[PDB]
């Protein structure tokens, strides 16, 4: 069975953790989380050798009450605990904090609804009512999705991707109508299949990208008046495109992750030519994240239960026959800590090389590869 091979390979991983990691923490959550994002704040403790970092998590339970979660993590300047539980209707598909106000968190639900929460407007412990009380309900979609991106340059601008083939755009600062409701400012109808992900450009407030099951990458400009035709249509992959992410240091670079088992690299100055293709055997990629500290570093996760960390600067490098046996030199590190599909991961923005990854079997891991692997 696959479960016997997984338990055995986990024990081999577990025993080798002192030789691969400088930091590795494992925590079993009450429910699996489909989402993971570090909050930007760090609370320094007076006289203690640790600092307190926070994570946005969610639950995925079908019989019981779901929650949006704020977890605390003690990291060196080892306890992980839930600080805040907020009732959520259905599982939290994705939860992301507003870059201009980290108290504001948007969530994707297993319904048409896109919700906005201000966690400071809620108690730490939820009421036994079972009622989901978001501060805003964003209208525009017909179906659920996962794709969610806040505009880092234009305060309150949020993009969402849906199974209904559309991309919605909201301005959450707009005057709400009826019951805390905001209608979509625009709906982008370029794709002819389920939209898997959306991402704003990190420097140009009017530019964003989208990826879908139609195997395309679309580049959009909100300054254009036609919301059915993107600026560019890129024939990015040979299968469904599940994710995309813009490089936080280069204003021209972005990555796409796909069901065709690859991560593609793109330059906005030359979209007709794919810069590079990172390949990993029998791994349908669902998440790609650039390092917030190092321009050439990005990580990916798919269905193979591993987390791959890539280094762009090592492409086309000479390798010893021994090293070459582990794979291409651009494959910097493999994290084999999980025993189920990784649902999401997030780079710690305050402590370089620290990552939080969450899997389908309810495990959350906080880890950092050995300083040695990258230096």
């Amino acid at each position: 069975v696959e479960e016997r091979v997984i338990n055995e390979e986990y024990k081999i991983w577990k025993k080798n953790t002192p030789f691969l990691y400088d930091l590795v923490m494992t925590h079993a959550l009450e429910w699996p989380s489909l989402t993971a994002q570090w909050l930007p704040d760090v609370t320094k403790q007076d006289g203690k050798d640790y600092s307190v970092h926070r994570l946005i998590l969610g639950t995925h339970t079908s019989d019981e009450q779901n929650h949006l979660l704020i977890a605390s993590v003690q990291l060196p300047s080892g306890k992980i605990e839930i600080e805040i539980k907020i009732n959520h209707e259905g599982e939290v598909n994705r939860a992301r904090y507003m870059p201009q106000n980290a108290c504001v968190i948007a969530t994707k639900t297993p319904s048409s609804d896109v919700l906005v929460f201000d966690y400071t407007k809620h108690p730490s412990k939820p009421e036994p009512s079972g009622e989901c009380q978001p501060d805003l309900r964003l209208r525009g979609h017909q179906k659920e999705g996962y794709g969610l991106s806040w505009n880092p340059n234009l305060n309150g601008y949020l993009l969402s991707a849906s199974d209904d083939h559309t991309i919605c755009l909201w301005d959450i600062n707009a005057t709400p109508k009826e019951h805390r409701v905001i209608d979509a400012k625009n709906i982008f109808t370029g794709h002819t299949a389920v939209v898997e992900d959306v991402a704003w450009h990190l420097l140009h407030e009017s530019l964003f990208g989208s990826v879908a099951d139609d195997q395309k990458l679309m580049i959009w400009d909100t300054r254009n008046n036609n919301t059915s035709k993107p600026s560019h249509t890129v024939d990015a992959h040979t299968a469904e495109v599940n994710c995309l992410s813009f490089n936080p240091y280069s204003e021209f670079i972005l990555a796409t992750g796909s069901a065709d088992k690859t991560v593609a690299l793109w330059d906005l100055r030359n979209l007709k030519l794919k810069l590079h293709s990172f390949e990993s055997h029998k791994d349908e990629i669902f998440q790609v994240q650039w390092s917030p500290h190092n321009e050439t570093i990005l990580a990916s996760s798919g269905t193979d239960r591993r987390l791959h960390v890539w280094d762009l600067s090592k492409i086309g490098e000479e390798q010893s026959t021994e090293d070459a046996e582990d794979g291409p030199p651009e494959l910097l590190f493999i994290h084999g800590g999980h025993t189920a599909k990784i649902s999401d991961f997030s780079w710690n923005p305050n402590e370089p090389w620290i990552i939080c990854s969450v899997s389908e079997d309810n495990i959350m891991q906080v880890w950092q590869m050995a300083e040695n692997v990258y230096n």
């Binding site: 002192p18 691969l20 591993r306 590190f333 493999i334 084999g336 050995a370």
Partner: peptide
């Protein structure tokens, strides 16, 4: 499907 890269083990470096 490797668990880790043998080149990333501290004792192999």
């Amino acid at each position: 499907n490797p668990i880790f890269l043998n080149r990333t083990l501290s004792y192999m470096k």
